[PDB]
């Protein structure tokens, strides 16, 4: 067994981290006090769930998690939350004043004063690991801490854990829930500085999750609680192979091997189905073919884009529930003849499939209905570059006038880092177009 | 970022600052004696932003009252909420400033400024995480204008990493005390351009027009004008005083509203305008909130473009309908929002409405049309300065004509800077 | 009040559409770079489809189908017909893609033997002169020749596909005729540019419309335009668009697309219709601009943003 | 259409379906960047205090 350490940075990362670990506890049968009766090896063990949980002498199962936020309000709710006993104080790190939606303030000014503390608290967990795989970093693009402090942390992790893998779960900025005008700036800056240090990054556009909640859950004005419960379902589908017995994506390295043929293009598109409202009295349970076909509808993707006008480099189907290989192949055969699925000439046109018989777990009192079978498709398509174009275009509009730039220079940053980061994004868009056309 | 230190200087600053504390003390369930008698924990969740907690669980405003004569401050101490203020935070002189920027900034105010900074320091030392300072003052007088900007400069020297915010009342011949007001205002604007992060331009011309044209007040008094100011001050600070995600602290507000450091002068707006029993609909709030007749600065928004906008809806309403109506204004009037700042309109919602109203909306706009205000002051300034009229009041306090020429040039530069981004594409 | 932007100043068709939209008092034109638009009359090259449908509170529509170039490019059309099982093909001339591929396959068919190469055109009987990206297509050596004149022609049909992928064929077509008699060994290329440079003898501007051409087929051949030609045209239009429908449809997309196409057909002496090419940004006939551009607003624009001359090709 | 590498267990199973074959900076360098930006802050703050100090001198001369 090899351990994984989760790192939650900023408000978005922390609150999403809370939803995930809550979902992890329900799936593994861990109670809010960290006690799991199902575990018979009291005080230790090398089971599959031990990748995300350590065990104490009293039988408490403690997440291998570190929460970080440059201000205390959000993490304080974890200190007094339902799962307060789950964590111990050393895992929760808070400052007093935040980055004010300013990348330079989270990376240079305030980040320099707390980076050593966080690395030290991460070193505490790494010492409890017989064989650490790497890290799962949760953060936003638009926040000053999520963008600024994450880039600095990812730089230092490559120094202290050069052989370990690092996966991201990134929240892409959407004006419908946005809190700052300069989020395009922070997104480009943190992507440029974190690119070479990230092995595989799963982007989640708040726009897509917002509309999925409105369309498929009948929520007029979705809240962060609505968005995060749905995001945690996708994150759980992606990490279930690390927490349960299986043979597909059993360690963080397989994610890079199965989904990332070229390092810079490490942004797989995630698509999830079915999303059913719990308020709905009854719902006709969808078949294997129906949910697999839904993986090719843009309305179910984590980023709104058109994979038909790009090319695939890899595809992974992750089923949970009553699914057998026979139904999957019959669904893939039907879909090949209808959908427009183009692979790059230097990749096999195929799918890696993983099935876990335990159906998806829904938080009681949530908005998602229980389903007998669900799927999450991870496909590395060049169409996701549409999100980089949207982001870079907004960056170009503001930076041409140097709007808000003085806020970053005032924190010690140089204007040159803006154009340096934008030029790296211009190359990234070019890499996608070479592969996709 | 939790504590804000309030400062009110001069006649206008203290009469307006006093009404501000009366309004928000009612919204936070604090009585004139500082005791809490509210019915919602949302009132006390962010009470430490503007109040200190005393011994017997009393709440003392974190406010400092400044003036060069005791006249107005004695009226505050005798006012309804006068007992709530910390007695030691009353710092006042005797000689007065005679509506003279020089007296407040260089002579009379210099004698008193160190005493004020001692009270500021005493209040800042007990702050867990000081956001910065907010100042209420006029620009047309002497104390609030001259000593006010002196305080801002000396506070920035001692707290250069804190946010400086002001509510600045702009003079107008319609509500004018002396003819030297354009002098005092031009000199102060230059100071504000350099040493503040956020300035709400409250124009006495607009307040009078609103009282006369809209509220049908034949003879508006300063009390009638201050009802509009108190209501606007409550709205623009709602996001600071109640739990929320958008513009919840002074620095994040500055990052969202100030694309260029010198262009930090905001046009406030409020709806509905009061001096009624029918509650307004969300479409009505949005239309009036953006109407020129609701702007507290006498500028036509259609003559300029919006760099950034902050909107605050208060009360119990459909947050979906709020999102819809806000998108409607932007999509129907896209030309008046600069296209080179995407998504420059941010909206917040608070469930607690102000007193007397079930629904309210507050507008905070950074429009290039604010240049019309500075143009107006500059024309009044130059009309007298081309003949050196009334300058002896200032040269007698040690000032040189060169300092006036510099202030005139600096404000004309500010006007040109606003015009740059009004035609920028 | 709806909003739209214009990003193709050279579009004679949509210059009239934007003129008609403003004339209704319910459409406001924004700056070309204003993102808060309902309709986009986009450019021909590098249209930013990825930035569409991301404006909350704005139903956005664009006058181009992303991916339609597969049908409106010479080499792409050949590749599409040969590789698509639903097209396999009796109505498309035998063609081959040649780079300066299927060259050895083109010579196998070479062993009537007159061809044509295009992408500057070259018609030759010997293949060596042709080879000395392009597509080599079989030249129709026996075209239907109009009389009096003994001359060549081609038919242009305008097709409108709306956001629901309804296929609308404009009633009025046009025959871009040659004014010179066809010689087997200017009379071969019926382009309006090549003919305008004996022009305008039989019909005005070498443009014969359907009323005159239908009367000719009745008097000269004892048949109608509908039966002899139009049935094959509607079949070809439907087959081409229904083939690419799964790849370009915006049915479940965050933005909607429509597009006006220009199909160019050739008729042989046996009254058989052949497809020549499909144009993605076509122009209209002068006397037909008014009726067609109004039909675009009613069927493609006003259907999405509310305020017959078409034949609906049902699926 | 081939199905390969079928692994089964009690929790589930996995496999691969093919439809067609194919045709860092050091800690020192980081600390330099962080401290180089910190010095640009101190410089800008010192230029401000220098500017404010010149204003204090003007207040005396008046
Ligand atoms: N999905 C989701 N997005 C969030 C959540 N919280 C914040 N965001 C998004 O993240 C962006 C803002 O960044 P934050 O994470 O809130 O800021 P931060 O990391 O705390 O950094 P600071 O600027 O120092 O406060 C916006 O685009 C928000 O919409 C959340 O709980 N769930
Ligand atoms: N296989 C073929 N057989 C007979 N004639 C042909 C032919 N291919 C082309 N032609 C003739 O050459 C002319 C030009 O062909 P083509 O349409 O490919 O060029 P083009 O695209 O520049 C004109 P447009 O864009 O208006 O259709 C046609 O009108 C036709 O008369
Ligand atoms: N709105 C408002 N404006 C005032 C009030 N008192 C004075 N002013 C304005 O402020 C200017 C005079 O400044 P004032 O505050 O009286 O001088 P100071 O005491 O030396 O600061 C004039 O332009 C007045 O119109 C008031 O109570 N309300
Ligand atoms: Ca165990
Ligand atoms: Ca004295
Ligand atoms: Ca002292
Ligand atoms: Mg935060
Ligand atoms: Mg006075
Ligand atoms: Mg053509």
């Amino acid at each position: 067994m090899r351990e994984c350490i989760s790192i939650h940075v900023g408000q978005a990362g922390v609150q999403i981290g809370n939803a995930c670990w809550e979902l992890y506890c329900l799936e593994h049968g861990i109670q809010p006090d960290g006690q799991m009766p199902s575990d018979k090896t009291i005080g230790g063990g090398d089971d599959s769930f031990n990748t995300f949980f350590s065990e104490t002498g009293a039988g408490k199962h403690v997440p291998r998690a570190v929460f970080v936020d440059l201000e205390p309000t959000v993490i304080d709710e974890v200190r007094t939350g339902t799962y307060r006993q789950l964590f111990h104080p050393e895992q929760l790190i808070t400052g007093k004043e935040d980055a004010a939606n300013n990348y330079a303030r989270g990376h240079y000014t305030i980040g320099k004063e707390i980076i050593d503390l966080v690395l030290d608290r991460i070193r505490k967990l790494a010492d409890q690991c017989t064989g650490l795989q790497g890290f799962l970093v949760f953060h936003s693009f638009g926040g000053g801490t999520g963008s600024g402090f994450t880039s600095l942390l990812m730089e230092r992790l490559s120094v202290d854990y050069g052989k370990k893998s690092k996966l991201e779960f990134s929240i892409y900025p959407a004006p419908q829930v946005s809190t700052a005008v300069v989020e395009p700036y922070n997104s480009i800056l943190t992507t440029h500085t974190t690119l070479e240090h990230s092995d595989c990054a799963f982007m989640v556009d708040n726009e897509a999750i917002y509309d999925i909640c409105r369309r498929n859950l009948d929520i007029e004005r979705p809240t962060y609680t609505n968005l995060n419960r749905l995001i945690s379902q996708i994150v759980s589908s992606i990490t279930a192979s690390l927490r349960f017995d299986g043979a597909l994506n059993v360690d963080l390295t397989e994610f890079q091997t199965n989904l990332v043929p070229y390092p810079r293009i490490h942004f797989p598109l995630a698509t999830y189905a079915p999303v059913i409202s719990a308020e709905k009295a009854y719902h006709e349970q969808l078949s294997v073919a129906e949910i697999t076909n839904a993986c090719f509808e843009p309305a179910n993707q984590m980023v709104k884009c058109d994979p038909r006008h790009g090319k695939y480099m890899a595809c992974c189907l992750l089923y949970r529930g009553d699914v057998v290989p026979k139904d999957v192949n019959a669904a893939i055969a039907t879909i090949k003849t209808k959908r427009s699925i183009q692979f790059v000439d230097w990749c096999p046109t195929g799918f890696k499939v993983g099935i876990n018989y335990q159906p998806p777990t829904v938080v009681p009192g949530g908005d998602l209905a229980k389903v007998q079978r669900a799927v999450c498709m991870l496909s590395n398509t060049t169409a996701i570059a549409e999100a980089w174009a949207r982001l870079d275009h907004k960056f170009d509009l503001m930076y041409a006038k140097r709007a808000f730039v003085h806020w970053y220079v005032g924190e010690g940053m140089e204007e040159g880092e803006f154009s340096e980061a934008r030029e790296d994004m211009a190359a990234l868009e070019k890499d996608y177009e070479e592969v996709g056309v | 970022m939790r504590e804000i230190v309030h400062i009110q200087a001069g006649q206008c600053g203290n009469q307006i600052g006093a009404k501000f504390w009366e309004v928000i003390s009612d919204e936070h369930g604090i009585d004139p004696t500082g005791s809490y008698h509210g019915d919602s924990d949302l009132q006390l969740e962010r009470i430490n932003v503007y109040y200190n907690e005393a011994t017997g669980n009393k709440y003392v405003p974190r406010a400092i009252l400044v003036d060069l004569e005791p006249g107005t401050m004695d009226s505050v101490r005798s006012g309804p909420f006068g007992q709530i203020f910390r007695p030691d935070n009353f710092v006042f002189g005797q000689s007065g400033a005679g509506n003279n920027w020089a007296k407040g900034h260089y002579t009379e105010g210099a004698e008193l400024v160190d005493s004020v900074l001692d009270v500021v320091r005493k209040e800042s030392e007990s702050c867990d995480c000081l956001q910065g300072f907010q100042l209420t003052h006029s620009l047309g007088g002497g104390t609030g204008s001259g000593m006010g900007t002196l305080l801002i400069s000396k506070i920035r020297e001692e707290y250069p990493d804190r946010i400086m915010n002001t509510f600045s009342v702009m003079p107008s011949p319609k509500v004018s005390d002396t003819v030297v007001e354009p002098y005092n205002a031009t000199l102060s604007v230059h100071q504000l351009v350099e040493n503040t992060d956020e300035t709400y331009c409250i124009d006495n011309e607009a307040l009078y027009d609103i009282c006369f044209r809209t509220l049908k007040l034949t003879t508006p008094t300063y009390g009638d004008l201050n009802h509009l100011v108190s209501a606007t001050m409550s709205g623009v600070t709602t996001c600071l005083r109640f739990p929320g995600q958008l513009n919840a602290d002074l620095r994040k507000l500055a990052v969202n509203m100030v694309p260029f450091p010198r262009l930090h002068f905001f046009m406030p707006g409020f709806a509905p305008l009061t001096s009624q029993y029918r509650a307004l609909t969300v479409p009505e709030l949005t239309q009036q909130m953006f109407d020129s007749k609701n702007m507290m600065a006498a500028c036509d928004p259609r003559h300029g473009r919006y760099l950034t906008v902050a909107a605050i809806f208060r009360g119990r309403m459909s947050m979906k309908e709020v999102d819809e109506q806000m998108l409607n204004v932007q999509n129907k009037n896209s030309s008046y929002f600069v296209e080179w700042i995407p998504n420059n309109v941010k909206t917040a919602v608070c469930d607690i409405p102000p007193r007397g109203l079930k629904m309210s909306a507050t507008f905070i706009g950074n429009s290039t049309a604010i240049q019309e205000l500075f143009k107006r002051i500059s024309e009044q300034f130059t009309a007298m300065f081309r003949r050196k009229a009334f300058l002896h009041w200032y040269t007698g306090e040690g000032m040189d004509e060169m300092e006036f020429t510099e202030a005139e040039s600096n404000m004309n530069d500010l006007v040109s800077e606003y015009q740059q981004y009004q035609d920028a594409t | 009040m709806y909003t739209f932007v214009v990003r193709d100043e050279n579009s004679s068709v949509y210059a009239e559409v934007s003129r008609l939209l403003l004339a209704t008092g319910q459409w406001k034109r924004l700056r070309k770079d204003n993102p808060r638009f309902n309709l986009m009359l986009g450019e021909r090259n590098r249209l930013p489809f990825g930035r569409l449908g991301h404006e909350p509170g704005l139903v956005q529509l664009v006058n181009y189908y992303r991916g339609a170039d597969k049908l409106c490019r010479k080499a792409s059309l050949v590749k599409l017909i040969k590789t698509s099982p639903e097209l396999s093909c009796t109505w498309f001339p035998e063609s081959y893609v040649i780079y300066p591929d299927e060259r050895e396959v083109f010579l196998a068919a070479y062993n009537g033997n007159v061809w044509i190469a295009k992408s500057g055109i070259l018609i030759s009987s010997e293949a060596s002169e042709l080879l000395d990206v392009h597509v080599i297509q079989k030249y129709l050596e026996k075209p239907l020749l109009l009389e009096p004149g003994h001359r060549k022609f081609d038919i242009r049909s305008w097709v409108l596909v709306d956001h629901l992928y309804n296929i609308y064929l404009y009633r009025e077509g046009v025959l871009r005729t040659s004014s010179e008699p066809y010689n087997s060994a200017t009379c071969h290329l019926t382009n309006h540019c090549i003919q305008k440079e004996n022009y305008g003898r039989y019909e005005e501007g070498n443009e014969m419309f359907f009323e005159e051409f239908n009367q000719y087929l009745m008097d000269a051949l004892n048949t109608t335009l509908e039966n002899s030609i139009l049935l094959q045209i509607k079949h070809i239009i439907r087959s081409c668009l229904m083939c690419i429908e799964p790849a370009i449809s915006t049915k479940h997309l965050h933005y909607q697309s429509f597009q006006l196409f220009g199909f160019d057909f050739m008729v042989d002496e046996e009254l058989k219709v052949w497809l020549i090419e499909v144009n993605g940004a076509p122009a209209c006939a002068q006397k037909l601009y008014a009726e067609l551009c109004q039909g675009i607003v009613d069927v493609a624009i006003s259907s999405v943003f509310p305020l017959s001359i078409f034949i609906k090709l049902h699926h | 259409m081939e199905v390969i590498e079928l692994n089964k267990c009690t929790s589930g199973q996995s496999f691969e379906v093919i439809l067609k074959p194919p045709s860092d900076p050091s800690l020192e360098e980081i600390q330099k960047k962080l401290e180089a930006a910190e010095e640009r802050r101190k410089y800008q703050e010192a230029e401000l205090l220098k500017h404010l100090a010149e204003k204090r001198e003007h207040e005396r001369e008046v």
Side-chain angles (χ1 to χ4, degrees), chain C residues 31-82:
Chain C
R31 298 175 177 177
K32 56 184 294 184
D33 300 330
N34 192 331
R36 297 186 172 278
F37 56 85
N38 291 117
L39 175 64
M40 169 172 174
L41 309 182
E43 60 272 45
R44 300 181 186 86
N45 309 128
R46 310 201 64 82
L47 195 158
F49 290 102
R51 303 207 300 264
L52 299 173
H54 296 284
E55 288 297 339
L58 281 183
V59 179
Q60 293 193 314
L61 176 67
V62 61
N63 67 338
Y64 278 93
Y65 261 98
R66 190 181 186 187
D69 54 311
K70 247 69 176 182
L71 199 69
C72 305
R73 254 65 185 184
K74 294 294 198 303
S76 301
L77 182 63
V78 177
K79 178 193 173 188
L80 180 68
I81 295 175
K82 292 185 174 180

Side-chain angles (χ1 to χ4, degrees), chain A residues 11 69 71 98, chain B residues 252:
Chain A
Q11 175 174 304
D69 199 0
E71 64 99 356
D98 66 16
Chain B
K252 278 183 175 178

Side-chain angles (χ1 to χ4, degrees), chain B residues 23 130 296 305:
Chain B
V23 172
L130 176 64
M296 304 297 161
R305 309 188 72 193

Side-chain angles (χ1 to χ4, degrees), chain C residues 49 52 60-66 161-165 248-251 253 255-259 300 304:
Chain C
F49 290 102
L52 299 173
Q60 293 193 314
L61 176 67
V62 61
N63 67 338
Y64 278 93
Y65 261 98
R66 190 181 186 187
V161 181
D162 64 11
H163 62 294
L164 307 177
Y165 219 87
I248 68 176
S249 176
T250 64
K251 180 180 181 179
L253 252 191
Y255 74 92
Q256 301 280 37
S257 296
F258 69 92
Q259 188 172 342
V304 181

